């Protein structure tokens, strides 16, 4: 309703996006009503119903459609929380191929774009989950939280798949028990990779702090040494100075 | 583990504590007072050496001006009375006696 629905440029662009999604996802092949369908700018009510049914079944698969879909469209949109629902009049829903299709056309686009984003919103989640399932010491923190999240979602994955078996019919015999052991090996393995990696980080750090430490204790040893030699040298010089005058005097005080 | 300092901080603390300042300072006050002692010994004895360099350079400019020159490099005394290119050379050997030496010298000076 807050959209330039009557603007011909807007209509054109949105038509393009509609066509692009329906064609990309094999709309016409999956349903032959709009076989090789291209830009309905003068739609047919039948086809409209086709498109709506397909898109919604993609949003909500399993929805039983009655034999007349025009009856369910308003309720479907009310359940979906269609934001523009107020701009649509129930009366105008029966036959939309007339004047106000400019509104209903817009609606269709809103669905497509919505669909575009839904398949995105969900896919990113799917992808995200995949990332969490395989998810210098100071710099990388929280890693333990990532391994505990891992094991939460790895135990989750394990549960869901093992159950898919448990309820499944054909497969449950050989593939079940082995599957467990296999999933179990990955765990101890990868974290063992961690353990050893950090043992090596530990020891090579030992050569870091040890190279530096050794060098340091060496220069310390140096200071101690030359400091000692310095004091000693001074003290020798002093001692000599004190003695010499003593002797000089020793021989000169005979006035006989 | 070794080739390393077991406790370096203790080593350096140690190194500071046995570095004895007041001892060396006291040795330098010592050396100053030594010098001052000498300076007074030299000095009161530089009037005794202005009286032994006047007693000696009066009896040395005088003895020397008598023509008697100690040559102790060669263990001998030179007598130059005439300064004509001829001198008398008297060895300081313990052999000759003191009376004969004296008599001889005064004979040479009387020529």
């Amino acid at each position: 309703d807050p959209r330039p629905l009557r603007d011909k440029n807007f209509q054109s662009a949105i038509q393009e996006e509609i066509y692009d999604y329906l064609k990309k996802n094999k709309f016409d092949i999956e349903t032959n009503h709009p076989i090789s369908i291209k830009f309905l700018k003068q739609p047919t009510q039948k086809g409209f119903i086709i498109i709506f049914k397909w898109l919604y079944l993609r949003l909500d698969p399993g929805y039983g459609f009655t034999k007349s879909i025009e009856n369910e469209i308003y309720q479907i949109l009310k359940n979906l929380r269609y934001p523009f629902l107020e701009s649509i009049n129930k009366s105008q829903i029966s036959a939309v191929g007339g004047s106000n299709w400019h509104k209903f056309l817009g609606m269709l686009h809103w669905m497509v774009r919505t669909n575009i984003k839904l398949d995105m919103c969900l896919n990113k989640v799917d992808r995200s989950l995949i990332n969490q399932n395989t998810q210098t010491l100071d710099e990388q923190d929280q890693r333990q939280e990532r391994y505990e999240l891992m094991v939460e979602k790895l135990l989750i994955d394990y549960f869901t798949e093992s159950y898919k078996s448990f309820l499944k019919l054909e497969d449950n015999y050989e593939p079940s028990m082995q599957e467990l052991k296999l999933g179990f090996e990955k765990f101890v393995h990868i974290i063992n990779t961690d353990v050893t990696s950090t043992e090596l980080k530990l020891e090579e750090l030992k050569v870091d702090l040890n190279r530096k430490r050794y060098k340091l204790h060496q220069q310390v040893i140096h200071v101690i040494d030359i400091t000692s030699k310095f004091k000693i040298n001074i003290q020798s010089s002093l001692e000599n100075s004190e003695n010499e005058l003593g002797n000089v005097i020793e021989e000169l005080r005979n006035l006989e | 583990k070794d080739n390393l300092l077991d406790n370096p901080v203790e080593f350096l603390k140690e190194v500071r504590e046995s570095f004895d300042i007041q001892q060396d300072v006291d040795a330098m006050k010592r050396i100053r007072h030594d010098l001052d002692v000498i300076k007074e010994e030299s000095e009161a004895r530089i009037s005794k050496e202005h009286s032994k360099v006047s007693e000696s350079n009066k009896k040395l400019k005088l003895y020397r001006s008598l023509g008697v020159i100690l040559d102790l490099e060669n263990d001998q005394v030179l007598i130059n009375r005439k300064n004509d290119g001829n001198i008398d050379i008297l060895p300081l050997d313990n052999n000759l006696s003191d009376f004969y030496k004296t008599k001889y010298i005064w004979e040479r000076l009387g020529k």
Partner: nanobody, 105 residues
């Protein structure tokens, strides 16, 4: 720790001598034992140069970079004849095997 002594032997009187002791493996010092007598403390030097002694004919020093202590004797006397033992402590925990010093009258 190993204490390696060197520099002893038969020496004429009035001469000079220097004994060395190298530690391998705080204070380092010298004792001595004259023939038929008890061991006697000669003197010590701490890692820093605190010297505790014996008269001016004997002088102890150290090179810390070499971990070595030195005992210098001048104008040697017949009473100096003895077995001179190097010793080292963590403050006695370590001893050398001893180094003969014989002053020939």
């Amino acid at each position: 720790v190993q204490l390696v002594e060197s520099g002893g032997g038969l020496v004429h009187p009035g001469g000079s001598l220097r004994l060395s002791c190298a530690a391998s493996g705080h204070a380092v010092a010298w004792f001595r034992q004259a023939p038929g007598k008890e061991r006697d403390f000669v003197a010590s030097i701490n890692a820093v140069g605190l010297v505790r002694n014996v008269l001016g004919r004997f002088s102890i020093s150290r090179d810390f970079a070499k971990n070595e202590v030195y005992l210098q004797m001048n104008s040697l006397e017949p009473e100096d004849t003895a077995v001179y033992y190097c010793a080292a402590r963590y403050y006695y925990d370590y001893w050398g095997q001893g180094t003969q010093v014989t002053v020939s009258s």
